[PDB]
Amino acid sequence: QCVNFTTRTQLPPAYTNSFTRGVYYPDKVFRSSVLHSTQDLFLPFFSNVTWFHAIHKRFANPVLPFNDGVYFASTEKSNIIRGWIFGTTLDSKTQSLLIVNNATNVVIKVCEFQFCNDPFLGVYYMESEFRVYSSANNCTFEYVSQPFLNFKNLREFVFKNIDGYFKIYSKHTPINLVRGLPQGFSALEPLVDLPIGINITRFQTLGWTAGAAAYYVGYLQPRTFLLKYNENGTITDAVDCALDPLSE
Amino acid sequence: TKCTLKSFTVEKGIYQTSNFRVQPTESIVRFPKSTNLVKNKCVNFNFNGLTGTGVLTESNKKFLPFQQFGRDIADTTDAVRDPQTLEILDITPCSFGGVSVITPGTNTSNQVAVLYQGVNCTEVNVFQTRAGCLIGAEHVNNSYECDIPIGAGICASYQSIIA
Amino acid sequence: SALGKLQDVVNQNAQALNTLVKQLSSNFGAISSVLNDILSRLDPPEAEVQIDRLITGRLQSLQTYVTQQLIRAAEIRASANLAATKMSECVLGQSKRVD
Amino acid sequence: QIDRLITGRLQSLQTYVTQQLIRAAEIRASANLAATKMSECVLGQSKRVD
Amino acid sequence: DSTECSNLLLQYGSFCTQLNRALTGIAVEQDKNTQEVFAQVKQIYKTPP
Amino acid sequence: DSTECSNLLLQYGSFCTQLNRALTGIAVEQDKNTQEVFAQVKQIYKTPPIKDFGGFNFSQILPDPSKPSKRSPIEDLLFNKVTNGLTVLPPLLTDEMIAQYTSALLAGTITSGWTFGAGP
Numbered sequence A: 001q002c003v004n005f006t007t008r009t010q011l012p013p014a015y016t017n018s019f020t021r022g023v024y025y026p027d028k029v030f031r032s033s034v035l036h037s038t039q040d041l042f043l044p045f046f047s048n049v050t051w052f053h054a055i056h057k058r059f060a061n062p063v064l065p066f067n068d069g070v071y072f073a074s075t076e077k078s079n080i081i082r083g084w085i086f087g088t089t090l091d092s093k094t095q096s097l098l099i100v101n102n103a104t105n106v107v108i109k110v111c112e113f114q115f116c117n118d119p120f121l122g123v124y125y126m127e128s129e130f131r132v133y134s135s136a137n138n139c140t141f142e143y144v145s146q147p148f149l150n151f152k153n154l155r156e157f158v159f160k161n162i163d164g165y166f167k168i169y170s171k172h173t174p175i176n177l178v179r180g181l182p183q184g185f186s187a188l189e190p191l192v193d194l195p196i197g198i199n200i201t202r203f204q205t206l207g208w209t210a211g212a213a214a215y216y217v218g219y220l221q222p223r224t225f226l227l228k229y230n231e232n233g234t235i236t237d238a239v240d241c242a243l244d245p246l247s248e
Numbered sequence B: 001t002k003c004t005l006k007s008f009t010v011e012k013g014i015y016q017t018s019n020f021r022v023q024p025t026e027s028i029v030r031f032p033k034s035t036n037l038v039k040n041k042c043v044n045f046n047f048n049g050l051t052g053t054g055v056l057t058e059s060n061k062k063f064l065p066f067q068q069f070g071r072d073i074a075d076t077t078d079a080v081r082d083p084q085t086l087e088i089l090d091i092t093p094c095s096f097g098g099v100s101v102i103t104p105g106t107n108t109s110n111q112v113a114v115l116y117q118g119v120n121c122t123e124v125n126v127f128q129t130r131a132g133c134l135i136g137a138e139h140v141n142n143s144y145e146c147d148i149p150i151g152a153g154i155c156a157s158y159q160s161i162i163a
Numbered sequence C: 001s002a003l004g005k006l007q008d009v010v011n012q013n014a015q016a017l018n019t020l021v022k023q024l025s026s027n028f029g030a031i032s033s034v035l036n037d038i039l040s041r042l043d044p045p046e047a048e049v050q051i052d053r054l055i056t057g058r059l060q061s062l063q064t065y066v067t068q069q070l071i072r073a074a075e076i077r078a079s080a081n082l083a084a085t086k087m088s089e090c091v092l093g094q095s096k097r098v099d
Numbered sequence D: 001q002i003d004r005l006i007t008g009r010l011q012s013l014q015t016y017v018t019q020q021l022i023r024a025a026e027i028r029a030s031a032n033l034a035a036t037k038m039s040e041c042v043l044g045q046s047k048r049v050d
Numbered sequence E: 001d002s003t004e005c006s007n008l009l010l011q012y013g014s015f016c017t018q019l020n021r022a023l024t025g026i027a028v029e030q031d032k033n034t035q036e037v038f039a040q041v042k043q044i045y046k047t048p049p
Numbered sequence F: 001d002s003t004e005c006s007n008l009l010l011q012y013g014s015f016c017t018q019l020n021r022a023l024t025g026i027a028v029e030q031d032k033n034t035q036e037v038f039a040q041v042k043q044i045y046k047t048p049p050i051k052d053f054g055g056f057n058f059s060q061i062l063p064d065p066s067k068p069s070k071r072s073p074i075e076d077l078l079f080n081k082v083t084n085g086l087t088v089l090p091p092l093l094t095d096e097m098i099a100q101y102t103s104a105l106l107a108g109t110i111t112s113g114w115t116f117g118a119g120p
């Protein structure tokens, strides 16, 4: 089942500043009171991060490229954002990745889904509406896990696909800022490593009323960071090696 | 010492002749079979595919739940998390040290003393110095002029060999 | 920055030791910098070549470290000879030498 | 082939840096001597013979 | 300007950093030598007319 | 600990002996430097208990009895202000003995002037 949404309001997507967000732990190695220089796929400091809104009538689900990796930020309250779609052609021709977080658990499936143009979930005022795909024929990987999840909640995720490994990094932050990204530093802990081994070039974010939510999409570039590890092994500050001559 | 110096007569002094390595005794292979963990001994450890040789002791470092191994400034693995039981272990490198021979002239005597540099005396007339463990020299409380330098204020002389 | 000369010597020696330890992580054109990985992954005819590449790289690093250690030893020896001269002529006597 | 060129050029550069450091030590010793002569011969009268 | 040569050169580690640091030390040492020899007075004296 | 690596390393000859000999020469040279700088007197001079020097105060350079290290306040400040087969050999002269040598030199130059450097 698929449903066209024909009540949208035309508006260009916004842009804002990344500040010093998007830093994740590059590996599983504990380091304490040290300064470590690493070259990896990172989000540049103070970059132009794309801003999308969900407000009522805005429902921003466009088609975005994936490129080398995607930093996904969410200023969320009342749990509207539920999951992501990854793939190349987003149909039964190629193999696609499904990540959903419904009312009970988090489900990851790698199947050849015949996706809808507007895949979505629904809450009736309980969850009794699910229209994401019409078929699933060849499934290779399944993974059922625990639930991962004024704007009150900040969700940071980093999605990377290197050597057939899908790295998902996550961080949950209590915030009380009304409209934009708070200015600060928070290192993203690694959440899961999935051996999906599939090509990903495009991704999707998952009458009617749209709850108040906002999300941000940034793109990773190969660069060097200098990370500071404190006495407790937590990354507390970072330096972008190619941002400005002072940080260089 | 005669072999190292390429001479049959050795002048009075201290000569670094060899090295000592505490040889590994057991192999501990812990993945998430699991060979019974042995601590406080120089063993060959294989933890989740990370291999090496070291002494596994208790650690006061509180790891974050996602982190498994630990590295210092010089990118050497000095801390690790046991996969079976979530405890933190320090990996101290197995003792290695220079072996120096302290002797007077062969014209005077053939008595020698052995200094293990930077090695505690429990891991080898046994005396513990800051330079290392000295075997074969009788420690005295008197102070004399330095005849053969040992280090850290310690000197050796022949009168038997005293330190 | 009053005591910069001693801190400079300590920093240079520590930096040389850190660089020498860090050079073990380099494979010097071999498949890996770990000897155990080479010995467990390859047959001895090609593992001999890989170990030879590691040996020549590490030996070049060690010779380089010894070379700058000898040069710094010469510099410190000259400074120590100057310090001994100052101890003999300024502390143990009165010097007519200007400055 | 590039590896052979790299090791040859790196050996040449390390050799050049080594003699540069040795000449730097010699020039530093000469400069220390020159500073001593400037302090003792120009800024005062020296009783040191020759 | 060869990218492949630089990629192979990165396998040898921090030799280039060592050589650049040594040359930088020599270069600052020359200026220190010139300061030690010539800059021993903080007053610029002038002869009478 | 690789036996095969050491067997291949033996083909290159006595490079390791040369490097160890050079490092040993540097290590003994450091102790020789410390002997040349600080051990220039064979008598350990001491100051009188009464510090009556005609108004001259040497408390900041004489050793402090209250400190366990027996260092001067200036020397204590100086010590506070300075912060895989590798071994660090300890120096032959420890810091307290070097401080004792400096104390002997200070006592000699205060109580005897330059006479102790040239004889009795």
Ligand SMILES: *[C@@H]1O[C@H](CO)[C@@H](O[C@@H]2O[C@H](CO)[C@@H](O)[C@H](O)[C@H]2NC(C)=O)[C@H](O)[C@H]1NC(C)=O
Pocket: A002, A003, A004, A117, A118
């Ligand atoms: C919702 O709208 C999309 C976009 O118009 C529909 O996708 C089209 O499906 C027809 C099927 O005949 C294709 O010919 C078009 O090329 C498709 N358009 C695009 C942009 O892919 C989709 O079918 C609609 N959903 C429903 C249930 O009708």
Ligand SMILES: *[C@@H]1O[C@H](CO)[C@@H](O[C@@H]2O[C@H](CO)[C@@H](O)[C@H](O)[C@H]2NC(C)=O)[C@H](O)[C@H]1NC(C)=O
Pocket: F051, F057, F058, F059
């Ligand atoms: C020599 O100088 C020292 C320090 O300059 C004097 O010690 C001071 O004594 C006064 C009064 O007793 C104290 O209030 C100061 O705190 C002391 N200073 C220190 C650093 O302890 C000392 O009295 C002077 N005279 C003699 C004869 O030693």
Ligand SMILES: *[C@@H]1O[C@H](CO)[C@@H](O)[C@H](O)[C@H]1NC(C)=O
Pocket: A015, A016, A048
């Ligand atoms: C971000 O991009 C938009 C267009 O893509 C541009 O108008 C805006 O000025 C950019 N902002 C910054 C800070 O570069």
Ligand SMILES: *[C@@H]1O[C@H](CO)[C@@H](O)[C@H](O)[C@H]1NC(C)=O
Pocket: A102, A103, A104, A105, A107, A127
């Ligand atoms: C959530 O999804 C899983 C997998 O599709 C399903 O088994 C479960 O019943 C779902 N939960 C709800 C409340 O629908």
Ligand SMILES: *[C@@H]1O[C@H](CO)[C@@H](O)[C@H](O)[C@H]1NC(C)=O
Pocket: A137, A138
């Ligand atoms: C994928 O599914 C189609 C039809 O559902 C089938 O013909 C094809 O063999 C499947 N391929 C694999 C690799 O399972």
Ligand SMILES: *[C@@H]1O[C@H](CO)[C@@H](O)[C@H](O)[C@H]1NC(C)=O
Pocket: A088, A199, A200, A201
């Ligand atoms: C992945 O897909 C893109 C476009 O669909 C294509 O250009 C690229 O070559 C593909 N890569 C692999 C490894 O299949």
Ligand SMILES: *[C@@H]1O[C@H](CO)[C@@H](O)[C@H](O)[C@H]1NC(C)=O
Pocket: A230, A231, A232
């Ligand atoms: C590190 O943890 C200790 C408690 O183990 C705490 O007292 C200290 O403040 C922490 N430091 C930082 C920088 O978080």
